[PDB]
Amino acid sequence: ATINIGTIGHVAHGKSTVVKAISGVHTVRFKNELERNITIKLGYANAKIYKLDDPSCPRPECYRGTKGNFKLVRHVSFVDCPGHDILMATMLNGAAVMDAALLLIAGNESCPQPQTSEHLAAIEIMKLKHILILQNKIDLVKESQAKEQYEQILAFVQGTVAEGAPIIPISAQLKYNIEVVCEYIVKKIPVPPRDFTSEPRLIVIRSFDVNKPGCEVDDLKGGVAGGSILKGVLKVGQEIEVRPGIVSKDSEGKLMCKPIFSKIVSLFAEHNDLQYAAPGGLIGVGTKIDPTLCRADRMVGQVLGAVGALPEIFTELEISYFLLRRLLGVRTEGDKKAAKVQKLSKNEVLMVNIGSLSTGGRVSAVKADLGKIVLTNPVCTEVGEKIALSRRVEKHWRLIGWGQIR
């Protein structure tokens, strides 16, 4: 639970060896028919990041490269990206309030590589600043391809910011240069500032369930979900308010919004559970309440506040927006120069990732720069500087717009 570094994975890397080189192993995960893998999601790690007076950051045995009495202080975290070029737009949803970024380049595909800056194309509005140059061809074709290919990849670094950390030519099946890669991600990647004593909040992302058949009714049960901190550090056992929570159906007033808070026990931390919520990673929040409400799949997209919080939540929405004048990065000369990105039509489905929550976007009135919308469910107020409008243009989603709360 320390760093939310991102990664940009196109087709055919070999992904379990590189991610498990930087996350150790996979978590025990479950409850199939999950959510479609182009939606919002988060990563994790079963490792940590450290050193041993050593460029090498091994796995937690203390001798095997050599000694160095590892600092059992923190745990590394991560954000997932499977190895196909589809993984653009939900990652650019994730490329706003994460921590850093990996940058994946193969040599298996086209060597005048099309996809990487087709992938990395929000280096201005949101944050995209900490990367690495990472060659993934040591296997098939030797030093001629890599020889011209380092000139290829240094033909990327000029105004498109592709120079954050220089070339690492590897195949992660050998796990090579992970001493040098770990030295880069210790030293050459910093840790950005946070806030500590702020009142903590969370929007719920990835719910779970812990009452499989075969136990007693006297067990402690409740609602476990997933999340990651935007502010504060969340302790155990207080008035943890969720402000509308359930969709308040047939709500006739304003004070007919229900006061519902909870408590908390589990905050999963790979071996333990530090009861103050360690940010910079996936936090394993489990609520006290025993309903049909939260511990089902019913709850994704609600706030974590306290008694007497500030945001009042209704549907009155007006947004100021603009668009993108092509489909971002995609330009194929074999009959693909008309992937047209059309203006906001009335009553059209969208994806409005306000902050970091996927609710589908409905619209009601269209001007050239502002729009009055109404949304599919009651949705909290998070930020005005980004309202990440996405929209159907192909089989999966792509992001099209940037918004502003008015």
């Binding site: 030093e143 380092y150 690492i168 030519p169």
Partner: peptide, 16 residues
Amino acid sequence: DYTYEELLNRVFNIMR
């Protein structure tokens, strides 16, 4: 980028 010629000698002379 000295890391690349470090690979070019040692890594490819010893490993893949």
